[PDB]
Design a protein around this nucleic acid. Sequence first.
RNA 1: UCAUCUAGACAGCCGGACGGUGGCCAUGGAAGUCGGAAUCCGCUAAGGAGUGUGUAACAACUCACCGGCCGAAUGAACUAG
RNA 2: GGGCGUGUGGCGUAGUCGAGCGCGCUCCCUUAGCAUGGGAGAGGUCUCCGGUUCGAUUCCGGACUCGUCCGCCA
Lengths: 136, 468, 104, 52, 225
Amino acid sequence: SGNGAQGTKFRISLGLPVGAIMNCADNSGARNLYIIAVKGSGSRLNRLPAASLGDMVMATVKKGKPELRKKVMPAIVVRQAKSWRRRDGVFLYFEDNAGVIANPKGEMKGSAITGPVGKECADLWPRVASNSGVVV
Amino acid sequence: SFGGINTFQQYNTDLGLGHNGVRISLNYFDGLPDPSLLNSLYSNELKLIFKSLLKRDETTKEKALMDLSNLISDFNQNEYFFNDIFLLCWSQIYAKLIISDYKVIRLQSHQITIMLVKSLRKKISKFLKDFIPLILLGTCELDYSVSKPSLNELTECFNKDPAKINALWAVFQEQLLNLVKEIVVNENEDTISDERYSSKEESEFRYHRVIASAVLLLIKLFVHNKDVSERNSSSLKVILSDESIWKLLNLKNGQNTNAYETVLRLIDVLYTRGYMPSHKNIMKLAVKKLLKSLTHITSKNILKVCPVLPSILNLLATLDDYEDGTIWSYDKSSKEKVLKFLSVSRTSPSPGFFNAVFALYSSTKRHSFLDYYLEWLPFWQKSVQRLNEKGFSARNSAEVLNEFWTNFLKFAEDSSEERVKKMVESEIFNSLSCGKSLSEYTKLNQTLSGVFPPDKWEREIEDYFTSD
Amino acid sequence: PLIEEVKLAVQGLIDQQMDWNTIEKLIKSEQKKGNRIAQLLNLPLNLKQNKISVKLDLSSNEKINVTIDLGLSAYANATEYFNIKKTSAQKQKKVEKNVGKAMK
Amino acid sequence: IIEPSLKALASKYNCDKSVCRKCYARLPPRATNCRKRKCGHTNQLRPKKKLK
Amino acid sequence: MATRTQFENSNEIGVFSKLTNTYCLVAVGGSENFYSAFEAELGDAIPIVHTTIAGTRIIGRMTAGNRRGLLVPTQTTDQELQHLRNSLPDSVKIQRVEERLSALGNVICCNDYVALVHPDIDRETEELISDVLGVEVFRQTISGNILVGSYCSLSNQGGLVHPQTSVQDQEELSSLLQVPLVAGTVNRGSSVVGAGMVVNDYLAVTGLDTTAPELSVIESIFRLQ
RNA sequence: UCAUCUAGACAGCCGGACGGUGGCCAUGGAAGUCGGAAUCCGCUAAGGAGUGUGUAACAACUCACCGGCCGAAUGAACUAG
RNA sequence: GGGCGUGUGGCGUAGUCGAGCGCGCUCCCUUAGCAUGGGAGAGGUCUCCGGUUCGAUUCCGGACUCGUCCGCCA
Ligand SMILES: [Mg+2]
Ligand SMILES: [Zn+2]
């Protein structure tokens, strides 16, 4: 995350390392996002920088519209599909990995989100919560 | 702590609103408190409050006002703090604050001054001349939220005596006029608001809101003081002559017609007083601008400008009476403007519009402004047709139709011609017959009590039953 | 002396930590209201290099525009203009020494 | 602005010092040698750089 | 007034607050300036409730409010529901909604008289809105934007809609809602106007980066003067 | 190696630190103090045709010189263990 | 990476400290074609920026750019 964080986030189990391809949930014309970096990740020998729900990543559009391909852009993870624990102790997970496109300040490139988003992401990014249909 | 000298000000020797040796002015650039006086303040706390008020950001200004208010609220402990020096400085800053874009700043400033007057009563006498006009300007501000609380507080300050409030208008009337002059003549949109931080618009919007308040104040001053015209004629002339008051009469652009309405009231009040008749140039300038306004109303803005239209026509009727329709004579194309205005206005009817139209006709008929048959009737007929088609779809339609009938019926009476009589009957029948549910709205039926002899209406009912 | 009065006025406005554009607007308003000290000034102010410019009558109706440093006295600015005069003369003498051998 | 006398009193402790050219030590204004061992008590001193 | 406010830096006030004529709701994790704006402008006549909806600071997008009633999602806990029942006046009705879309502020754009909803809501939820809020309902999209609550700001006097909206859609929605509508932007050009600001009959609260022409458009369309 | 020294030295306080003369050139000015040369008398206990700050030029302040207090060694440059 | 040199008009290219020609084409005239030729055109921040000079392409310093040459291990 980093700059555009609205508050802090509890540790969510990391599910999306570098090289992961997730679905592109918004209506910006991109089909999938390919994660090349995680904002705020630490440094360890041989350890891959991994992303969780609500994290801001750097991503490229591998499949989609040609004006979105072949460049790096920030993205926000909204669906994780690797099970994580909340402080009320429910273990929950979606069925796919999904993110949306944003600028470095966090406002969405698109306008609407298809499918659910996590509340740990909706609380942390208000534009995602603004364009989100259902928040769970 | 505070450094620098206002050397330029010393040469000028104009105190603007102030009468206590400190210039008090609305413009951002000047009238700022002198550095030396600021140092003289009794406590450090007060000085910091003043620096914050000077800073541009609103959150900072508001926080300082909140602090000042708290200090005033605890008056007994802090009475030493508020001295003549504080009052002189406050007076200079208060003027700038009341013109502030943010309502909270405006409201708090007004509340604070009133508290000072209540707490320091009889010691603010020297400063009453500076403070009172500004307080009143706030009580006559278009926004209800700023004005109503301010007035209530003022009344409370004077122990709920109506006489005292009225007295204030009388006692400081010369000063109140000076404030109006300063806003209208001395100031310009640029002077009031900084160009760097504002657009060409907004700066205009702000000036207009402030000037509207000045006009409202002027109207109030005139009503309160009977002899104001005679005593302050020279000052009144300069304020009236300037086009700034008149520039407000533009309906092409602008958020509200409330400001425009205020100007109309002023013209009417001046006519009632006879100042407008007395001074021809002011009257002509006002009249020409009013005529121009008629052109401004257009199909695109008809919905927005509809409430103000009954008022515009009523003023015109009163003006026409002066000088035997002299007002139309001033402009060569005035008749054309009126005709155009009527055509645009008829399409959308607002409550009271028809009465105004009839009033205009009544004033004009003696001098034959509009041809009764060639010109006026077409206007009337088209109007009823329009009314019926969108009928009674809207709410108050019942009232609007009722009005048309009462007015048209009067117009028809002064005809003595068959076509007019024929039109009346045919239109009436059409209006009732296509109708909507005229009978069903009892009020509508009551208001539209009748249009013809009783027996004939019965014969028509007879035909409906007799019909195939 | 009147230049020193204008300098003291502008420096007093500067020492209030007032914004430069608001100072220029204050100069324009006082010129409109007929203050002599304001009307002696030219409005594109070089406060970034601590320099003002002032109108002086050529005959004791034509006016000349002269730049005055705020950090030096008026007499010291006059000595700087004299110094720029004196440096120009030496270059002219160097040109006169140049002319014969150059044109040959 | 502080006050002229109070600016003088604060600048007596903050600005009216000398700086050793070798080890950057803040020194008395009338000093002749640095008081530090690491520069070898050198006499290469300069005035502390003022504003204005 | 359109009052300049931030939620700890956030210029979106409709996300973190829900303002009606009768009550106000604000998030629990708020700054002193953010609370002081609603406390000064609203006064003591109108209750301000510090609330959490479904464990989230976002409350404006989670709930849809009216002077007659308040709608909350299924995930709202019993402690939050009881706290809202105690803090709110007896006039308003609070009822949980069991519906898949579950973010009622995004789904529903509503005022005192007439409401716009997401087209794909369930019929039981539509009847629940019509019962609790006492409000007639239309299923419509604003130029293809299904999130009418996020992309419209609505009051009794007027409405602000999305800037990239077809004009034909503007008179259609204006005739359907019986209020005048203006296409405009908030928060230095942000498209999400309903998330950008909250409004009622006499107050509008917006972000600090909302510019002066935008604020003038707000006060003009909502008649706050 | 030079100088000063109970006929009062070096630090520290306090007082004076003057006239011919605004010496001669040169500059729009420069009067001790932008520079070029000379650099002398008077009164002296003592005071430079000036050590700096210093002003457009002045004015003003301080110096190196002499004096009251102090009463005895001290200052500069250099050399090497 | 370093060394060594280099840089002129729209293109090519000449210059001792006192920017010129050709070409392209700007125009006009010329002509039985298998269409030429004549006369007048414009054109540079001399790679750039400083300094010396009285003036530097012309001298010099820096930077830029291009071309060359030489370079790692087992
Ligand atoms: Mg490795
Ligand atoms: Zn040292």
